[PDB]
């Protein structure tokens, strides 16, 4: 479960200064659980 945070800090600084990724956000949540499986 802690990994869920490992991902937040990841897209946290990226989306914090990225004005061109308000769509790929969804495709991201998909890989989210994909990581929990390992």
Structure, described:
The protein has 38 residues and is mostly helical. It has one domain (2-36). It has helices spanning 2-16, 24-36. The chain is flat.
What topology does this entry show?
Layout: H1 2-16, H2 24-36
Helix content: over 70%
Secondary-structure element pattern, one letter each: HH
Morphology call: flat
Number of strands: 0
Distance N to C terminus:
11 Å
Largest sheet: none
Number of separate helices: 2
PDB class: de novo design
Keywords: DE novo design, helix-turn-helix
Assembly: monomeric
Entry title: alpha-T-alpha, A DE novo designed peptide, NMR, 23 structures
Please outline what is shown here.
The PDB classes it as de novo design. The chain is mainly α and 38 residues long. It contains 2 helices and no strands.
Descriptive labels:
2 helices, 38 residues, mainly alpha, flat
């Amino acid at each position: 479960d802690w990994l869920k945070a490992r991902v937040e800090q990841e897209l946290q600084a990226l989306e914090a200064r990225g004005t061109d990724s308000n769509a790929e956000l969804r495709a991201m949540e998909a890989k989210l659980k994909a990581e929990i499986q390992k």
